[PDB]
Structure of Peptidyl-prolyl cis-trans isomerase FKBP5:
Amino acid sequence: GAPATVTEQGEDITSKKDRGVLKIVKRVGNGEETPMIGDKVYVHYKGKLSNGKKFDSSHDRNEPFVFSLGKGQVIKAWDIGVATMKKGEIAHLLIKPEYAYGSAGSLPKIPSNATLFFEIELLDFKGE
Ligand SMILES: COc1cc2cc(c1OC)OCCCn1cc(nn1)CCCOC(=O)[C@@H]1CCCCN1C(=O)[C@H]2C1CCCCC1
Protein backbone atom coordinates (compact mmCIF):
# COMPACT_ATOMS: atom_id res chain seq x y z
CA GLY A 1 0.00 0.00 0.00
CA ALA A 2 0.84 3.68 0.11
CA PRO A 3 2.81 3.31 3.41
CA ALA A 4 5.08 0.63 1.90
CA THR A 5 5.69 2.85 -1.11
CA VAL A 6 6.86 5.58 1.24
CA THR A 7 9.16 3.15 3.11
CA GLU A 8 10.73 2.35 -0.30
CA GLN A 9 10.58 5.62 -2.30
CA GLY A 10 10.18 8.26 0.41
CA GLU A 11 12.70 11.08 0.95
CA ASP A 12 14.16 11.30 4.45
CA ILE A 13 13.34 14.84 5.42
CA THR A 14 14.76 14.67 8.98
CA SER A 15 17.76 16.81 9.95
CA LYS A 16 19.25 13.80 11.74
CA LYS A 17 18.84 11.52 8.68
CA ASP A 18 17.22 8.90 10.91
CA ARG A 19 14.37 8.01 8.49
CA GLY A 20 11.89 9.23 11.14
CA VAL A 21 9.87 11.28 8.64
CA LEU A 22 9.67 10.01 5.05
CA LYS A 23 7.90 11.97 2.32
CA ILE A 24 6.55 11.41 -1.17
CA VAL A 25 5.15 14.28 -3.16
CA LYS A 26 1.93 12.91 -4.73
CA ARG A 27 0.82 16.13 -6.47
CA VAL A 28 3.20 19.05 -7.13
CA GLY A 29 2.09 22.44 -5.79
CA ASN A 30 2.32 26.00 -7.12
CA GLY A 31 5.02 28.65 -6.68
CA GLU A 32 8.37 28.21 -4.85
CA GLU A 33 7.18 29.42 -1.38
CA THR A 34 6.94 27.00 1.55
CA PRO A 35 5.63 28.13 4.94
CA MET A 36 7.73 29.66 7.67
CA ILE A 37 7.60 29.07 11.38
CA GLY A 38 4.61 30.94 12.81
CA ASP A 39 2.61 30.94 9.54
CA LYS A 40 -1.09 29.95 9.77
CA VAL A 41 -1.42 26.75 7.76
CA TYR A 42 -4.59 25.30 6.12
CA VAL A 43 -4.72 21.63 5.15
CA HIS A 44 -6.91 18.66 4.39
CA TYR A 45 -5.53 15.36 5.64
CA LYS A 46 -6.23 11.70 6.24
CA GLY A 47 -4.25 9.83 8.80
CA LYS A 48 -3.98 6.28 10.09
CA LEU A 49 -1.93 3.99 12.32
CA SER A 50 0.37 2.03 10.02
CA ASN A 51 -1.59 -1.09 11.09
CA GLY A 52 -4.84 0.80 10.06
CA LYS A 53 -6.74 0.35 13.35
CA LYS A 54 -7.62 4.11 13.75
CA PHE A 55 -8.35 6.35 10.70
CA ASP A 56 -8.94 10.10 10.91
CA SER A 57 -9.97 12.54 8.20
CA SER A 58 -10.47 16.33 8.11
CA HIS A 59 -12.73 15.55 5.12
CA ASP A 60 -15.14 13.90 7.60
CA ARG A 61 -15.53 17.39 9.16
CA ASN A 62 -15.76 18.88 5.60
CA GLU A 63 -13.56 21.81 6.79
CA PRO A 64 -9.78 22.52 6.68
CA PHE A 65 -7.57 21.69 9.66
CA VAL A 66 -5.80 24.90 10.70
CA PHE A 67 -2.61 25.21 12.77
CA SER A 68 0.32 27.55 13.33
CA LEU A 69 3.50 25.98 11.95
CA GLY A 70 6.49 25.15 14.09
CA LYS A 71 4.86 25.78 17.46
CA GLY A 72 4.52 22.04 18.30
CA GLN A 73 0.65 22.46 18.08
CA VAL A 74 0.93 19.22 16.13
CA ILE A 75 3.32 16.27 16.22
CA LYS A 76 6.96 17.08 15.30
CA ALA A 77 6.56 15.17 11.98
CA TRP A 78 3.97 17.69 10.81
CA ASP A 79 6.05 20.73 11.79
CA ILE A 80 8.90 19.14 9.74
CA GLY A 81 6.81 17.84 6.82
CA VAL A 82 4.31 20.62 6.19
CA ALA A 83 7.23 23.07 6.27
CA THR A 84 8.54 21.37 3.07
CA MET A 85 5.26 21.71 1.15
CA LYS A 86 4.10 24.13 -1.56
CA LYS A 87 0.59 25.61 -1.80
CA GLY A 88 -1.59 23.01 -3.63
CA GLU A 89 0.88 20.17 -2.87
CA ILE A 90 -0.36 16.74 -1.78
CA ALA A 91 2.19 14.61 0.04
CA HIS A 92 2.39 11.27 1.85
CA LEU A 93 4.26 11.12 5.19
CA LEU A 94 5.36 8.01 7.01
CA ILE A 95 6.35 8.76 10.56
CA LYS A 96 8.34 6.78 13.15
CA PRO A 97 7.16 7.02 16.78
CA GLU A 98 9.97 9.41 17.79
CA TYR A 99 8.39 12.09 15.57
CA ALA A 100 4.78 11.27 16.52
CA TYR A 101 3.63 9.99 19.96
CA GLY A 102 6.73 8.11 21.14
CA SER A 103 7.05 5.35 23.70
CA ALA A 104 4.24 6.80 25.80
CA GLY A 105 1.71 6.88 22.98
CA SER A 106 -1.60 8.74 23.42
CA LEU A 107 -3.80 6.05 24.88
CA PRO A 108 -6.37 4.89 24.34
CA LYS A 109 -6.35 6.34 20.81
CA ILE A 110 -2.65 5.86 19.91
CA PRO A 111 -0.56 2.95 21.24
CA SER A 112 3.07 3.07 22.40
CA ASN A 113 5.65 3.06 19.63
CA ALA A 114 3.08 3.71 16.87
CA THR A 115 4.10 4.35 13.26
CA LEU A 116 1.76 6.88 11.56
CA PHE A 117 0.80 7.58 7.92
CA PHE A 118 -0.77 10.72 6.50
CA GLU A 119 -1.91 12.10 3.23
CA ILE A 120 -1.84 15.90 3.45
CA GLU A 121 -2.98 18.60 1.05
CA LEU A 122 -1.61 22.09 1.69
CA LEU A 123 -4.53 24.40 0.90
CA ASP A 124 -2.97 27.72 1.96
CA PHE A 125 -0.62 29.47 4.38
CA LYS A 126 -0.44 33.04 5.58
CA GLY A 127 1.72 35.14 7.89
CA GLU A 128 1.01 35.76 11.56
C1 LIG B 1 -3.74 12.31 19.75
O1 LIG B 1 -5.00 12.89 19.53
C2 LIG B 1 -5.37 13.03 18.22
C3 LIG B 1 -4.63 12.64 17.11
C4 LIG B 1 -5.18 12.71 15.84
C5 LIG B 1 -6.41 13.28 15.65
C6 LIG B 1 -7.15 13.70 16.74
C7 LIG B 1 -6.63 13.59 18.02
O2 LIG B 1 -7.50 13.84 19.09
C8 LIG B 1 -7.33 15.15 19.60
O3 LIG B 1 -8.45 14.17 16.72
C9 LIG B 1 -9.20 14.18 15.49
C10 LIG B 1 -10.25 15.26 15.55
C11 LIG B 1 -9.75 16.53 14.90
N1 LIG B 1 -8.56 17.06 15.57
C12 LIG B 1 -7.27 16.95 15.19
C13 LIG B 1 -6.54 17.52 16.20
N2 LIG B 1 -7.41 17.86 17.20
N3 LIG B 1 -8.64 17.55 16.83
C14 LIG B 1 -5.07 17.72 16.36
C15 LIG B 1 -4.51 16.82 17.45
C16 LIG B 1 -3.03 16.55 17.32
O4 LIG B 1 -2.84 15.67 16.16
C17 LIG B 1 -1.63 15.69 15.59
O5 LIG B 1 -0.70 16.33 15.96
C18 LIG B 1 -1.61 14.89 14.29
C19 LIG B 1 -1.36 15.87 13.14
C20 LIG B 1 -2.52 16.73 12.81
C21 LIG B 1 -3.71 15.88 12.49
C22 LIG B 1 -4.04 14.93 13.62
N4 LIG B 1 -2.86 14.14 14.08
C23 LIG B 1 -2.99 12.92 14.64
O6 LIG B 1 -2.06 12.37 15.24
C24 LIG B 1 -4.37 12.26 14.61
C25 LIG B 1 -4.26 10.73 14.58
C26 LIG B 1 -5.57 9.99 14.75
C27 LIG B 1 -5.45 8.47 14.64
C28 LIG B 1 -4.88 8.08 13.31
C29 LIG B 1 -3.55 8.78 13.22
C30 LIG B 1 -3.66 10.25 13.25
